[PDB]
Design a protein around this ligand. Structure first.
Ligand SMILES: [K+]
Ligand SMILES: [K+]
Ligand SMILES: [K+]
Ligand SMILES: [Mn+2]
Ligand SMILES: [Mn+2]
Ligand SMILES: [Mn+2]
Ligand SMILES: [Zn+2]
Ligand SMILES: [Zn+2]
Ligand SMILES: [Zn+2]
Lengths: 497, 497, 497
């Protein structure tokens, strides 16, 4: 789906479907009034009948009107004469996109310049959200349906703005396209079943990506190299599986050579059975989304690759399959981490932090200005912050402050949890430097505490996306692509773009 | 224990025990060094033998040394030569108090001026913490023992500071004694068993308190009156018990006539079986702690009275006993709250938000500038923040910040959780305006959202103390008195005292 | 630590710390009084102030006193003037040791002659417990710790008795040293994590032990040898794992060629996941303790080796790792045991009885006079007898009675449970000769009943140490040395030592 920006009058442009907003009590703003006049008052005449209340996202569809160049006109409600909230705005757009998806229209024109969005500027912010909701809402994962699905009609959507703001709208389109494309890659990887989507499969994907872009080199470290580096924790996790582990390094050099890089570390547990500390059966299929941390890294890279952003970015994907078997790790195993700290593995289902901890030690060789790890780490985060808000912790306030502020602008929000010292004692072990679990209280936090012990060489934040990376049921069961919008926004901020 | 401040020389005072700090270097600050000189290096001489490494809270006790008028000299470790964190400083004080209580001295002097506590001034803050830990450490709940403890010898403690800081150390003792006195009261009500501590009992407690204080008037609304004001949620909660519910009003007029009051609302569920949604048996004895919200309001009120703070403070205590029986509330019951909103009671074990929502409506009549509800509300908060940090939510950023700030200075921390709108819809009911539960995701937060719907009329905040109000096991098992220090400190800030 | 015995006067000896007892009521026995009198009433003067009440294990530390040759004097409470229970006596000792271990002195003198121990000799039995408690208290397992505790200052302890008592206190110290040394070996083996401590590791340890001792021949039977001897039940347990089973034979000829040997059989399940009948995750790490039967025999052997007792001793260690996999035993498998009896494995988590049954058959070839198996066999036993007392069953009343008495004199107690015939029907199988479980009733007993069917050719006894072999939680969590004291004492009894 192509998305473009033009500065012509709404009435003038030839199209399968023209879309304009209507407020409560039949209130037409400037753009919409011009279309009414140009349609010889056909639009205000139908509105007099009361079928459209004007509530945000409500629609009434018209078919072609004399004096117009549009085959169809779609009236969408924009609510009272007030700024819309983010959420309300996005729902208005998806509701539009929803009527268009069911039309035999090859193209559509959105003439929604009169809608104001709250705390959002009228050209960039407004449309960043519209463009992202629209392109992300075309996402289809029909690849394992043996009935090849009916190919859609819609291929082109044009956005109309005034001349003055056109450049700013195009900047929003460019960015949202980048993010939208990164989210599709993320969602594809997340939705892919674990029999096909294993670490080696992920290794192959990184290599292919590396063969497609000039500024990106990829290096894959296998099971033996993981072990040889002294990554005892990473190795312990993966050893129980017939599919061996991979540590994938995706190095994009887009800034100056002396620029200290940004490092993204993503948990890539391609399936999580719990291991010997086996999970219950119910809903275990959703554990294919335990590599969504690694998937959000792929997607963020794919968007920056698209934007050719001027930064150095090193991606590290810690990938393993957590399986039970005759050679799997046992509860009670003590291993030596790459850092030289010893860890008693009291629960083999707290394995994300184990692969992550050696990878964080590994990230030191890059001398980063920031290291962010992204993981579907804890059940406790879902209890804490539910489905809507990413868990965020770090050893540097300004860095967490930056990530927080990026989420607010992307509309992909995080929320900070504290790493107080009182929480550290929960990881105490009678025998090793630390245990890998802190018990049933403060589960998101003690996981954060565990990781922080390995992130002391640099500025570091940690993102628990256990709640935000997929949807468990209903129609829209699947990966969401979060937090690609946040991380991409944070990198955009860093790039001054 | 009686607490006084003096500014005379440590070497000089007549006392059973003189306490001085000693660092890891086997270092001595000014005071300990003066004490050593007055004993011609006898203290340095013992340290040379090396039994005391001076880690925070390690102790070496000595008897009569020549030069000194102190019968005993207690040496306490202060650690690595730094300013101490709060926790460490408090553990130092507790170790001292531990040793002191096990001696037959009627009396002790603390000569601790040399110790620095990180980011706290040497006279007010430093001593607010010391004085609180020492006095709160005196607490004994031995009322149900046949073999009662036979009183400790220690009945007075003198703190030494220099002439100049004396007024400030003294204000710290004043406030600290009020707080420690409020906490003892809160802890007694908490620890009391639920066959003795029921809603009528707490009513009686509150009447006595009314009679004893001139500036305080107490009103007790019984079950019939609760029913008549149309409090459908509150009544539904208490109806299954033989012990009827009470709504207790303690109105303290300490400010001017038309100073807008502060309102504290306490959850006073004196026992929580869960009701028809019965809780499992294990650990249920701890549900006598489900009235720790109300208990912490009593305690803060006591502290305020002792301090004669110039503010109007209205305390509303929402008291019921949650019992299964032939007339108890069913899951699926629909009740009409005092606000007029209807609630479907899907789970009878989410009863605290039910007594609280009617009380929040009741708080509107006092025209408050801040309403703060305190409640042992959700096991989810324990999952979120564990035992160290109180959860905090509200409808007003400045009030929330004020409470956060008060926690930091009181060493009784809270931490904010968001009340985003997307959580709201987890309470939707096909039948009533809302349900009382939102599923297993973001439980602490959804309980806050439930509550915000009854606080739209004023500045409001909510503290979930399920994880900070008591200790589950060990010889430490019992009420902690949190959050009396934060609440008190906030009110002091509001009085500017 | 080195322990010596002297018969000199308490006051007359030069030490870093002299330890003497003080009664409840300020009371001093003879030895305490001579110290007091030599220090010319210093001690008594101090006592008069009332700091030390004299409850058992209470202490008061003094520093250097005119008239004595000790740098420090440690007073320890000894309670009411009666003879102490074992438990109170061992606590007093452990308090003393905890104090001495934080002091910077090279040695200590224990002058505790005046303390009586209920039902024990003032020379041998009293000091067996003292010397063991103090030597076993020295235990540290810190090999997986990056930051270690630097070696203690305390290296030597002297015990003062009167000359008529000396030879017997020395005999107590010597039996207790061997015991403690065996316990340390046992605790090391138990605490080692299962990734390191597997059947092949234990085999290597036995071979090393057989190299260090001329009187010991070791022999190691691997997986295929276990299979070829017809050990269908032993083999089924181990087949699931990447780590193969080992049956370890350690032969100590200390008696005449024609003395019937004593046989000790150890359950050595190095990790127990339950297998296909998989255990829950919670506290599974503790199952590294499932080789504590084997560990306790290793450690009894070391003690027997240290003491050179003149007996024939054969140790048989039945070692396997119980793991789930594509080749693991299934519930419902029927195997043929070495005895020719067939067993239906109805639950794979009842595996210890399976390795042991085959091994009991193997024990026959040595023509033993007694066969004692030692196993962490059943959760039922912890429900039956707690942490304090080992379960004991057998087919001979004299053997059982001998083990019971041994446990009493050693203060490592057991308790007999009945093997009534009525219980044997619980093991009936409609297909095989017997199933390996008999259900929710009499669970420790039916395991006993099970094993007795393989022990008919000799006098036999079975010890279920599931509750006495390790401590679950807190900072004492770890293997205990039990039952090394009982087993060693039983053999001392047999040897007439
Ligand atoms: K996947
Ligand atoms: K109570
Ligand atoms: K072990
Ligand atoms: Mn897991
Ligand atoms: Mn409840
Ligand atoms: Mn088992
Ligand atoms: Zn995982
Ligand atoms: Zn409750
Ligand atoms: Zn076992």
């Amino acid at each position: 789906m192509e998305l473009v920006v033009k500065s012509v009058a709404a009435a003038s442009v030839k199209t399968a479907t023209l879309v304009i907003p209507v407020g409560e009590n039949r209130k037409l703003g400037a753009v919409a009034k011009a279309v009414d006049l140009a349609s010889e008052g056909a639009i205000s005449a139908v509105l007099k009948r009361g079928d459209l209340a004007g509530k945000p996202g409500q629609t009434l569809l018209l078919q072609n009107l004399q004096g117009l160049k549009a085959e169809r006109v779609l009236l969408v409600g924009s609510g009272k004469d007030e700024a819309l909230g983010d959420r309300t705005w996005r729902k208005l757009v998806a509701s539009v996109a929803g009527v268009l998806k069911g039309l035999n229209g090859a193209d559509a024109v959105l003439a929604l310049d009169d809608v104001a969005v709250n705390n959002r500027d009228a050209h960039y912010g407004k449309y960043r959200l519209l463009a992202e909701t629209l392109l992300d809402g075309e996402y289809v994962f029909d690849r394992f349906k043996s009935q090849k699905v009916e190919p859609r009609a819609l291929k082109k959507v044009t956005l109309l703005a005034d001349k003055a703001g056109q450049a700013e709208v195009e900047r929003a389109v460019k960015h949202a396209s980048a993010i939208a494309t990164g989210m599709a890659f993320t969602r594809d990887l997340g939705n892919l079943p674990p029999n096909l989507c294993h670490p080696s499969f992920l290794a192959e994907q990184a290599k292919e990506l590396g063969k497609a872009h000039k500024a990106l080199k990829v290096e894959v470290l296998d099971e033996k190299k993981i072990k040889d580096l002294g990554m005892g924790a990473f190795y312990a996790v993966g050893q129980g599986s017939d599919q061996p582990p991979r540590l994938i390094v995706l190095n994009y050099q887009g800034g100056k050579k002396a620029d200290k890089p940004f490092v993204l570390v993503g948990k890539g547990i391609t399936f999580d059975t719990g291991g010997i500390s086996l999970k219950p059966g119910a809903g275990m299929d959703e554990m294919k989304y335990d590599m969504c941390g690694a998937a959000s890294v792929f997607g963020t890279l794919r968007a920056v690759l698209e934007l050719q952003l001027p930064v150095n970015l090193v991606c590290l994907l810690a990938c393993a399959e957590n399986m039970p078997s005759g050679g799997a790790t046992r509860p009670g195993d003590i291993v030596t981490t790459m850092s030289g700290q010893t860890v008693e593995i009291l629960n083999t289902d707290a394995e994300g932090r184990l692969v992550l901890c050696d990878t964080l030690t590994y990230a030191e060789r890059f001398k980063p200005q920031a290291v962010i790890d992204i993981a579907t780490l804890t059940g406790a985060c879902i209890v804490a912050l539910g489905s809507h808000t990413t868990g965020l912790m770090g050893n540097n306030d300004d860095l967490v402050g930056q990530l927080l502020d990026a989420g607010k602008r992307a509309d992909d929000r995080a929320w900070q949890l504290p790493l107080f010292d009182e929480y550290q004692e929960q990881l105490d072990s009678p025998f090793a430097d630390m245990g890998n679990i802190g018990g049933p209280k403060a589960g998101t936090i003690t996981a954060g505490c565990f990781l922080s012990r390995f992130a002391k060489a640099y500025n570091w934040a940690h993102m628990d996306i256990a709640g935000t990376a997929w949807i468990s049921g209903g129609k829209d069961k699947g990966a969401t692509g979060r937090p690609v919008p946040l991380l991409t926004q944070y990198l955009l901020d860093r790039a001054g773009a």
